Amino acid sequence: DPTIRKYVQSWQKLDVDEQLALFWFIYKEMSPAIAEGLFNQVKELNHEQQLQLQRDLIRRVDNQLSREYGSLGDTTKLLFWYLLSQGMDNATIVPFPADYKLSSESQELLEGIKGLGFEQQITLFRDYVSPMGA
Numbered sequence: 001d002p003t004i005r006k007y008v009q010s011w012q013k014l015d016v017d018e019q020l021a022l023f024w025f026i027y028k029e030m031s032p033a034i035a036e037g038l039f040n041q042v043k044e045l046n047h048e049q050q051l052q053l054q055r056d057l058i059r060r061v062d063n064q065l066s067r068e069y070g071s072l073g074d075t076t077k078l079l080f081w082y083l084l085s086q087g088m089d090n091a092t093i094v095p096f097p098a099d100y101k102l103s104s105e106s107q108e109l110l111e112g113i114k115g116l117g118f119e120q121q122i123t124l125f126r127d128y129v130s131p132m133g134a
């Protein structure tokens with residue numbers, strides 16, 4: 001389980017967009033009210049602002065939405081990130097680009113994360129999204 005922190009640290013060394021790409025592809029290889037609430041504030045924005053929030057959450061930017069995120073529990077935070085992925089498959093959230101290919105480093109992490117067990121993956125994801133926001 002020290003290997004989980006290494007995934008988190010490796011994940012946190014990538015570019016912000018690279019991080020979001022890795023998170024999205026993992027989603028393709030696979031408290032709710034509070035999450036649905038924050039999720040509504042997201043899809044109520046313009047598609048561009050939807051992108052800037054997710055970046056701002058990874059960058060720990062200090063704004064109102066990041067503060068709300070940062071004030072939630074780990075479970076809610078991860079559920080929020082799930083509803084974002086669902087909102088993207090349903091075209092509710094700004095879509096993901098087809099022509100994006102993962103860096104050599106990212107594809108290594110992904111296959112490495114494909115090796116972990118479902119519960120270690122959940123543990124990984126919770127720790128990755130837990131310190132985001134403000």
Ligand SMILES: CC1=C(/C=C/C(C)=C/C=C/C(C)=C/C=C/C=C(C)/C=C/C=C(C)/C=C/C2=C(C)CCCC2(C)C)C(C)(C)CCC1
Nearest residue numbers: 017020021023024026027051078081082084085097100122
């Ligand atoms: C590419 C790019 C972009 C974008 C991107 C994005 C936007 C992404 C996103 C991504 C995402 C948005 C992702 C997500 C993910 C999610 C996930 C991965 C989730 C998971 C979850 C889970 C795992 C859960 C579990 C559970 C529950 C539900 C609760 C408790 C119990 C259990 C455990 C069952 C742009 C446009 C700028 C362009 C350039 C770059």
